[PDB]
Amino acid sequence: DGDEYFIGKYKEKDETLFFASYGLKRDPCQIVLGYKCSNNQTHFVLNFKTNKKSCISAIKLTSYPKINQNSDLTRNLYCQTGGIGTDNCKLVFKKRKRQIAANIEIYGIPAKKCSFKDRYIGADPLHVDSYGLSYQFDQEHGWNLERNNIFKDTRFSTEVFYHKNGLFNTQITYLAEEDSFSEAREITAKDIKKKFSIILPNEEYKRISFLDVYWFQETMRKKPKYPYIHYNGECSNENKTCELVFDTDELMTYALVKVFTNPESDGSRLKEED
Amino acid sequence: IILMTDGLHNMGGDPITVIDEIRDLLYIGKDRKNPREDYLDVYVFGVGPLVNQVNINALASKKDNEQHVFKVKDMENLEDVFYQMIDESQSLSLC
Amino acid sequence: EQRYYGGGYGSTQATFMVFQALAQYQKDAPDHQELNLDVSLQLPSRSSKIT
Ligand SMILES: *[C@@H]1O[C@H](CO)[C@@H](O[C@@H]2O[C@H](CO)[C@@H](O[C@@H]3O[C@H](CO)[C@@H](O)[C@H](O)[C@@H]3O)[C@H](O)[C@H]2NC(C)=O)[C@H](O)[C@H]1NC(C)=O
Ligand SMILES: *[C@@H]1O[C@H](CO[C@@H]2O[C@H](CO)[C@@H](O[C@@H]3O[C@H](CO)[C@@H](O)[C@H](O)[C@@H]3O)[C@H](O)[C@H]2NC(C)=O)[C@@H](O)[C@H](O)[C@H]1NC(C)=O
């Protein structure tokens, strides 16, 4: 069947930037249509770049033969430079002594309507997140829970970091069952800098209760350096517009945010832990 | 397998067939989807000027970007190789 | 088979609508029908799928 590694979400109504089969034991590759390689025992790098007015939407690599190893233990594919939403990325994939062949297809969508709000949301986001996994709750306090079937890492206390299908995910802080989803916001590449902030309504029925962040970021190594995302100030009832700043060690490529509102919320959410 | 033959003028047949048997026991020379070629490695070292290089090459293994067949001028180089290998892991202090 | 190009009493709105429909038809319809094949093959002697 093959080992399929995914970056981004596949769309059935789009076109592919290119598609090529690569012999991973070749030294070096064949420069197909003008793209360079770097092949080693432990690494395979494709310095792909396109000459079309479009932005990368997804990447899928199929490795042969199929080897029974879970793909959620570590990360295999990542665009070292650029990534999803750009026109080119330096795609790095780490090989094994058994994998000897690869089949790389890359998809791009027109740069005009270069948005991903139509594929990462789904039909009902109330019970299912972007990962496609259902929400699980606990009866101790009627709130959410934690998932332990994917790749996660922590740096400080009460820090959540998830990585799946090239998606980096975080939740601040926790979500209640009775809350009703309002809407979402997206950030394009042209609106992304080293540091940037957001402004959200926090009045009447738009009282902020829970937020989640999904993004695509670059890596300078197999182990990434997570951005330092921290809330500034207090999202209290007095200040009508709540704000949040982002500090990044590595430049981001895409950003998606979902808004959860509950008028009965007190503006603070933290377990009885120390 | 490491072999230090100085001669190898055959007497009693050729050792190719038994290498074939060895790799057939381990399921190496039967399929290409799972070659499993890296589970057997044969290294043969040549000593002296009376060596037959084609026989040694046909007796040893062959994998790309790697050298499994060697040859030295004298027996001294045989322990020079391994003393160098020992000294490789030594700290850079010694001259 | 009709070959009508306007002319008559109040034969203007229909001509405009049919001409704009024909313009949309020309703009949208390609010279052919959709054709995007993804043909793969597999060999009992080769591990990779040649696509
Ligand atoms: C096997 O080959 C791969 C490439 O296919 C090697 O990965 C590359 O290794 C070099 C040197 O370690 C990395 O260069 C780095 O560049 C940054 C840029 O500022 C520099 O600051 C560092 O000091 C370093 O020189 C390069 O990024 C890296 N590429 C990837 C995609 O990871 C790998 O090292 C090779 N392994 C060997 C030879 O054992
Ligand atoms: C809603 O706003 C809250 C207050 O804004 C922050 O704090 C002060 C006012 O309390 C803002 O003005 C400052 O006032 C100081 C006097 O107390 C001056 O000395 C100072 O120069 C400045 O003018 C200040 O700009 C503003 N930001 C910061 C970083 O202090 C804030 O506390 C809430 O968190 C905010 N609600 C949110 C962000 O959801």
From Swiss-Prot, chain A:
Species of the source: Lutzomyia longipalpis
One annotated Gene Ontology cellular component of this protein: extracellular region
Tissue specificity of this protein: Expressed in salivary glands.
Glycosylation sites: 239
Function, as annotated: Sand fly salivary protein with antithrombotic, and anti-complement (alternative pathway) activities. Is a slow, tight, non-competitive, and reversible inhibitor of factor Xa (FXa, F10). Is specific for FXa (Kd=3.86 nM) and does not interact with non-activated FX, or all other enzymes tested. In addition, it blocks prothrombinase and increases both prothrombin time and activated partial thromboplastin time. It also prevents protease-activated receptor 2 (F2RL1, PAR2) activation by FXa. In vivo, it abrogates edema formation triggered by injection of FXa in the paw of mice.
Keywords per UniProt: Blood coagulation cascade inhibiting toxin, Complement system impairing toxin, Disulfide bond, Glycoprotein, Hemostasis impairing toxin, Secreted, Signal, Toxin
Subcellular localization: Secreted
Keyword Disulfide bond appears in the UniProt entry: yes
Ranges in coiled-coil conformation: none
Record protein name field: Lufaxin
Gene Ontology MF: a single term: toxin activity
Residue pairs linked by disulfide bridges in the UniProt entry: 29-37, 55-114, 79-89, 235-242
Quaternary structure and interacting proteins, as annotated: Interacts with factor Xa. Associates with complement proconvertase C3b-B complex.
Swiss-Prot record, chain B:
Necessary cofactors: Mg(2+); Mn(2+)
Location of the protein in the cell: Cell surface
Catalytic activity: Cleavage of Arg-|-Ser bond in complement component C3 alpha-chain to yield C3a and C3b, and Arg-|-Xaa bond in complement component C5 alpha-chain to yield C5a and C5b
Domain of life per record: Eukaryota
Assembly with partners or alone: Catalytic component of the C3 convertase of the alternative complement pathway, also named C3bBb, composed of complement factor B Bb and complement C3b. Catalytic component of the C5 convertase of the alternative complement pathway, also named C3bBb3b, composed of complement factor B Bb and additional molecules of complement C3b. Interacts to CFP; this interaction contributes to the stabilization of the active C3-convertase enzyme complex.
Function of the protein: Serine protease component of the complement C3 and C5 convertase complexes of the alternative complement pathway. Following cleavage and activation by factor D (CFD), forms the C3 convertase together with complement C3b. As part of the C3 convertase, cleaves and activates C3 into C3a anaphylatoxin and C3b opsonin, the next components of the complement pathways. When an additional complement C3b molecule binds to the C3 convertase, forms the C5 convertase, which cleaves and activates C5 into C5a anaphylatoxin and C5b component of the membrane attack complex.
Protein name (record): Complement factor B Bb
Provenance organism: Homo sapiens (Human)
Lineage, uppermost ranks: Eukaryota, Metazoa, Chordata, Craniata, Vertebrata
UniProt gene name: CFB
Curated annotation (Swiss-Prot), chain C:
Lineage: superkingdom: Eukaryota
Site location (Cleavage): 46-47
Quaternary structure note: Interacts with CFH. Interacts with CR2.
Listed name of the protein: Complement C3d fragment
Annotated source species: Homo sapiens
Taxonomic lineage: Eukaryota, Metazoa, Chordata, Craniata, Vertebrata
Encoding gene, per UniProt annotation: C3
Span covered, complete protein: 1258 to 1308 of 1663
